[PDB]
């Protein structure tokens, strides 16, 4: 029941990899800011992200996605695109928020 937040690029930092290792079945992960790049289909980390979809609920912040030049169709199928209001709902739906800086 934890909402993990990842705001750093998976190609730049180890934040996303550590998150996916410790997040447990049923947990949610939100990619925002530079973390958005991990949600894009075709990258070198698509495999590990897709595998994560098997036990975690993944979300990506649409505003950051769009700001960086990507439409929702560019996301790995399964990752739900949310806006800031959705981000807020995720923090209240889950029991605790954990930031991976």
């Amino acid at each position: 029941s934890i909402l993990h937040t990842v705001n750093k690029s998976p190609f730049e930092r180890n934040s996303l990899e550590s998150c996916l290792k410790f997040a447990t079945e049923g947990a949610s992960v939100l990619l925002f800011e530079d973390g958005i790049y991990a949600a894009l289909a075709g990258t070198r980390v698509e495999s590990q992200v897709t595998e994560a979809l098997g036990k975690l609920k993944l979300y990506v912040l649409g505003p950051d996605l769009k700001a960086r030049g990507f439409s929702d169709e560019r996301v790995i199928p399964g990752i739900s695109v949310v806006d800031y209001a959705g981000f807020v709902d995720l923090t209240t739906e889950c029991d605790t928020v954990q930031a991976w800086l």
Partner: protein, 130 residues
């Protein structure tokens, strides 16, 4: 629900402050309470009134101040982190022998205990950093 927001980075250098602002605004429009917005580390730099950012882009400090005015938010800046970085209000200027202040009047300088206190009172602690 009640939120405690922590911002660890300075304005513009990192998107943290902007992300925290958009989150706060969205939460406030939903009727949720923001018990306190706490600035720590370089985050204390979001409280200076001396910025003159480009007019064709957002003014982070004034924007936070406008949000605080509209929703009556308690914006707190860590005194320890502020002393290390140069954020000064009237009290600090006198106690530290400075001939000027730079804090924005909508923010208040206080102890780190205000952060822990908020984490205890709020339902969720959302941290924005690097």
């Amino acid at each position: 629900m009640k939120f405690a927001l922590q911002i660890n980075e300075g304005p513009y250098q990192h998107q943290a402050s902007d992300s925290a602002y958009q989150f706060a605004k969205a939460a406030l429009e939903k009727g949720h309470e923001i018990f306190r917005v706490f600035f720590y580390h370089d985050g204390v730099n979001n409280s200076t009134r001396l910025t003159t950012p480009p007019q064709d882009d957002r003014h982070i400090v004034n924007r936070w101040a406008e949000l605080a005015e509209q929703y009556e938010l308690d914006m707190v800046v860590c005194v320890a982190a502020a002393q290390r970085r140069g954020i000064v209000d009237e009290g600090e200027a006198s106690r530290n022998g400075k001939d000027a202040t730079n804090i924005h009047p909508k923010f208040r300088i206080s102890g780190l205990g205000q952060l822990v206190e908020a984490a205890i009172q709020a339902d969720r602690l959302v941290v924005f950093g690097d």
